[PDB]
Design an enzyme around this catalytic site. Structure first.
Site, PDB file in Angstrom:
ATOM      1  N   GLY A  30       2.681   6.650   8.910  1.00  0.00           N
ATOM      2  CA  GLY A  30       4.352   6.070   8.536  1.00  0.00           C
ATOM      3  C   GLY A  30       4.958   5.133   9.534  1.00  0.00           C
ATOM      4  O   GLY A  30       6.174   5.006   9.291  1.00  0.00           O
ATOM      5  N   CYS A  41       3.852   1.941   9.164  1.00  0.00           N
ATOM      6  CA  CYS A  41       3.450   0.710   8.485  1.00  0.00           C
ATOM      7  C   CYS A  41       4.914   0.154   7.883  1.00  0.00           C
ATOM      8  O   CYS A  41       5.700   0.986   7.531  1.00  0.00           O
ATOM      9  CB  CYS A  41       2.614   0.915   7.335  1.00  0.00           C
ATOM     10  SG  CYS A  41       1.062   1.834   7.750  1.00  0.00           S
ATOM     11  N   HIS A  91       0.939  -1.346   0.062  1.00  0.00           N
ATOM     12  CA  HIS A  91      -0.093  -0.215   0.026  1.00  0.00           C
ATOM     13  C   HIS A  91       0.896   1.165   0.148  1.00  0.00           C
ATOM     14  O   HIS A  91       0.260   2.336   0.044  1.00  0.00           O
ATOM     15  CB  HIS A  91      -1.046  -0.144   1.152  1.00  0.00           C
ATOM     16  CG  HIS A  91      -0.406   0.370   2.478  1.00  0.00           C
ATOM     17  ND1 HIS A  91      -0.884  -0.454   3.657  1.00  0.00           N
ATOM     18  CD2 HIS A  91       0.149   1.489   3.014  1.00  0.00           C
ATOM     19  CE1 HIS A  91      -0.573  -0.026   4.675  1.00  0.00           C
ATOM     20  NE2 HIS A  91       0.246   1.216   4.037  1.00  0.00           N
TER      21      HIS A  91
END
Ligand SMILES: CC(=O)Nc1cnccc1C
Ligand SMILES: CC(=O)Nc1cnccc1C
EC number: 3.4.19.12
Lengths: 304, 304
Positions: B143, B145, B41
């Protein structure tokens, strides 16, 4: 979102951990530049610990009686001095992994990460606070002494704690990196009872702010209070007094959440008087006091 | 003595953390050998996340659209493939700090350390468990992830989790390092409700053993029970069923403490039926289920 008891990354400190052996005693040392710091009780037999004279014990020790090992390589010890309750072994090789560092003596209520080590090898990392009774509630077995407590400010490790003593109550005493014990504790196997483990009131408030920020709001009430009024209730509950300084320190969390510090205090007041009634706050059934306001801001903002 | 929620030392994993930027999205990547792993993603706008077609989004991306940074040095990306919900960016330089590692898919109830990162920089380390609903209760901002979950067996890091998703309930979903989500979760900004967050019964027992070992014994009672009888009570309290396997797993703690697993169960039973009555166990007002039997043995024995 989500709020977790979070240690600093241990890497920088892992790179400083050595094994110190004196005779049959092995514990952990902190290798910064060409110095290795360890508890001076490395020189004691468990018998010595009953009533050690460290200056006298020390006379019988030479540089070569201190066996310092980093990984599976031995460091040459070219000098030793006693500073308070730590030994500083001068080695011939500056630690190539020495981070930027400071030695800081923290106040009760200050939190720090502990890298628990055995034989100079890291086993784990947890978050602690210097309790108001200058104990810490660590996890430390035999061989964990010389394990250190730290904060990291971006790339600069502030060393605030070296592990020395388990008290008969299974709480912990240790020193700053100048060898000075937190509290009235001594590196002796003697009667040492901690005083009152009071709750760090500002830390609880910081953590109530953290909870509101992460959607746990059920305990927010319609009341406010005063410092003097809140403090009467704090006293009764073995909570530290709240100062205007604590209020100022909480300002940024007050600002962000739009909850006045004193309203939050009135919330905390009710939680004390009324308990949790079986509810949790950030998945805790008791009021957490081992997050500082700075801890909360850091973790809620994502500082690295 | 003392028992603490303890993460593995983060150093080995710190050495693997890079920043992955695709267009305006920046998150964390795991650099092992000449591969960088990150959530797929990274290629999504927040708009994309509503209904992303990842294969289609991906066609519009080249190696040079993936900006990989380790410290303040850029890594050259010489290939990219999608494996399930992770991207594997082939870089031209093998990570010089690659530890011995495995990719392992853990079971619900398994605990692991998370190194929370922002822009490939570590902010902190906490201990989590894979919940029975295949969520985790992490601490993750925008941020974070690509932050990973791991175990260390001496020198071998077993990567079990990469952070992907916050659920509308502020719990967390992510993948193993083959990109397969734990649970029925998907990398999409859609309605995703977790099922029942049941308590990890074996973990609570392990932690009751830890408590006895550290002198918290007040909850030890005169009763025993059976698996079937205990389980009726477990069911009623949203506790996982206890299996003979769980009993076997607890054997070494049973052995060390001389408390039969089923007697400890009868203790846990009473704690459930009767609550804590305002008492704490290892300084917790609720039954802790994020220590495994292996966690307890490790921390009680001092493995490194
Ligand atoms: C002298 C001393 O207290 N050593 C120690 C420290 N921490 C934990 C356990 C032990 C035996
Ligand atoms: C897509 C997504 O869920 N991103 C995220 C992950 N963890 C924490 C916060 C956020 C915004």
């Amino acid at each position: 979102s989500g709020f977790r008891k979070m240690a600093f990354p241990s890497g920088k400190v892992e790179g400083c951990m050595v094994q110190v052996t004196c005779g049959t005693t092995t514990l952990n040392g902190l290798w910064l530049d060409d110095v290795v710091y360890c508890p001076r009780h490395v020189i004691c037999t468990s018998e010595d610990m009953l009533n050690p004279n460290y200056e006298d014990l020390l006379i019988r020790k030479s540089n070569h009686n201190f066996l310092v090992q980093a990984g599976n390589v031995q460091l040459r010890v070219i000098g030793h001095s006693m500073q308070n309750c730590v030994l500083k072994l001068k080695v011939d090789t500056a630690n190539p992994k020495t981070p930027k560092y400071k030695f800081v003596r923290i106040q009760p209520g200050q939190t720090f990460s502990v890298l628990a080590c055995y034989n100079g090898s890291p086993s784990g990392v947890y978050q602690c606070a210097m309790r108001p009774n200058f104990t810490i509630k660590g996890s430390f077995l035999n061989g964990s002494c010389g394990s250190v407590g730290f904060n990291i400010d971006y790339d600069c490790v502030s060393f605030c704690y070296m592990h020395h003593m388990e008290l008969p109550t299974g709480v912990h005493a240790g020193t700053d990196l100048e060898g000075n014990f937190y509290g009235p504790f001594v590196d002796r196997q003697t009667a040492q009872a901690a005083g009152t483990d009071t709750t760090i009131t500002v830390n609880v408030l910081a953590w109530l702010y953290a909870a509101v920020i992460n959607g746990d709001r059920w305990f927010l009430n319609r009341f406010t209070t005063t410092l003097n009024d809140f403090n009467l209730v704090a006293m009764k509950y073995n909570y530290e007094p709240l100062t205007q300084d604590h209020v100022d320190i909480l300002g940024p969390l007050s600002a962000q959440t739009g909850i006045a510090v004193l309203d939050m205090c009135a919330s905390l007041k009710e939680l004390l008087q009324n308990g949790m009634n079986g509810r949790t706050i950030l998945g805790s059934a008791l009021l957490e006091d081992e997050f500082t306001p700075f801890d909360v801001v850091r973790q809620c903002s994502g500082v690295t």
